[model samples]
Target: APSDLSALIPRATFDQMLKHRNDGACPARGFYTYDAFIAAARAFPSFGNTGDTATRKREIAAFLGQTSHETTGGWPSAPDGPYAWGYCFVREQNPSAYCSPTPQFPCASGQQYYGRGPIQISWNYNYGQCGNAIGVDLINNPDLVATDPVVSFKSAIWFWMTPQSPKPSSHDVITSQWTPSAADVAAGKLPGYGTVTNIINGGLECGRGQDSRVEDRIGFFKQYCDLFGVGYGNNLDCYSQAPFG
Candidate 1:
């Protein structure tokens, strides 16, 4: 049975999430609502269901932390601090359609696949897979991720729970279900929030010495962990981990 995620993440916490979510620059300022988030989260059972309250809270924090970083509008000097700016943008700004030449997931006739939703899932294959998982047909209706709040949050939860080969699901990494293989150890892929970063966008942000983007992700995770009253887990940086294939 699926637990009431709204109970796990209460109304007050949700309000905190909304406090700095949108600013003047975000086009979808009024689109993502608290009700939409709770509704979308309730549809997925595995999410916020890994373990006890502390563990479950960490999972939610980690998921929101990463998505917040992906769609953040915060900078180091932003008001109310940078970590408060999660869910600021619903879609990528000035996107390139993210069309690939590969036929693995063919592009739609007139649709352009760009980063959308909280996780900002991009690329043709990603959109195709997320759509297939959620029965949304995102390949043909990528714009739905931006226009529909439930769909948008669903897409993000799908990406967080689903594994891309050669990388474990971000959920596994955060919930301690992932064990570093010999190859992973050689690559310095220790278990922690950092490994989640490696899973999400390691090629771009991990293994580089103190990438600001990776730091931004960490900042959100730590802030949320503190807010949720969970200990920020160990191995919080991916500065030395190699990217997963």
Candidate 2:
């Protein structure tokens, strides 16, 4: 299982996050600048539902494990340049709710509007709800995401625990109520998994104007899983463990 995270961050990650100050806001200047992003992540809220340190650690680790995939593009530091935000969720595809208006990228209705952060995960419902949860005013301060990484991280946490957007229907790796099978229309038969690439990647392939950061999805997820010590033969066994038991 994972270790205590009562201090808002695990010791291993905290030591690394503290190093971001070296660049003083110019992460693009170097590779080791990720520490700054990591430190900024620490400013977000910790687990409020749990009182136990280890349990809270496990819960937070689970959230980070999944989100890391969305934010860091799995590499934590994109080896390919241009995407140096280390899990930033900018609207690279559709320009809806959260994106600015442009002649070439006009906004759409009922489309995914909240893709601004390291996780590239957002929607109108999420923006309104998550914004309320953390008192960030997402609707008014959409740009706050680019300006404040800590707020972005907190917003991500709000999304992670919310039972709305991703919806609460299935269950799988994370503490979600929905299983992977329910997440996708097809590919819901991967042994222990009820869903697979189909559910997660279907919208992207179909050109439904959703976030198309597939490489980041797979990359960050694997790294977050590894970092949290999940899976077999890893440092922690929290991922393998059942939720709320």
Candidate 3:
């Protein structure tokens, strides 16, 4: 199910991701072998089901595109900081409970939330649920996120597919059925009506990413169209009034 990440991410990006795969102040450098990273990526399912090429492409493109937006700091990596490999969670010290501590002190009297894995998105609600689905104790064994890049990346995919509070797939930005669009007949691929390209452009038009730069959104949209054999005309002003900067 996991479409080959090598197609999405170039060798340079993969090499960069491998370098900063670990989290923690004293980060365990090079904890994941390159092969392990590739395996983890390959293991990531593009969707819950396998039919519907259009749906699959739409879902995968949307999921990876949006997640990459968050994880890569609006680019292929955290250009401004050291959070390059998308490590979001980290262990909480005695002072704080979870990574995003509230007014309550001592962090519920347990091992605290530590920024560890990719997607850089964290919380007990997220970690506990995703860890369970991925067969990891990210809640208690936060260290695993940093020590095992495979598990770390898999956790991200788990979170992406997990149902949200309202029961929608975490990849709601891309598809509601937990199925990629390009893989679905109803969704179709680029150059076809109602295809993944349109979905991505529409999502961008709706302003999906955190940093809603029109150009940036268009750039990502175009990039996906190029990668998955989707076709789009030269009309770049697809989403000009997205209410994003």
Best by lDDT: 1
TM-score of predicted model 3?
A: 0.51
Lowest lDDT block of 10, candidate 1:
17-26
For model 2, what is the error of residue 196's alpha carbon versus the real structure, in angstroms, after optimal superposition?
Answer: 9.5
Off by over 4 Å in 3: 1-38, 41-49, 73-110, 171-221, 231-245
Arrange candidates, best lDDT first: 1, 3, 2
lDDT of 1 by residue, 61-149 (tens): 99989999999888788887898888888878887878884667998878888899999989888899898888889888999999999
Clashing residue pairs, candidate 1? none
Worst lDDT 10-window in candidate 3: 187-196
Ranking by TM-score: 1, 3, 2
What is candidate 3's CA lDDT for residue 147?
Answer: 68
lDDT of 3 at 144: 73
On TM-score, the candidate that comes out on top is: 1
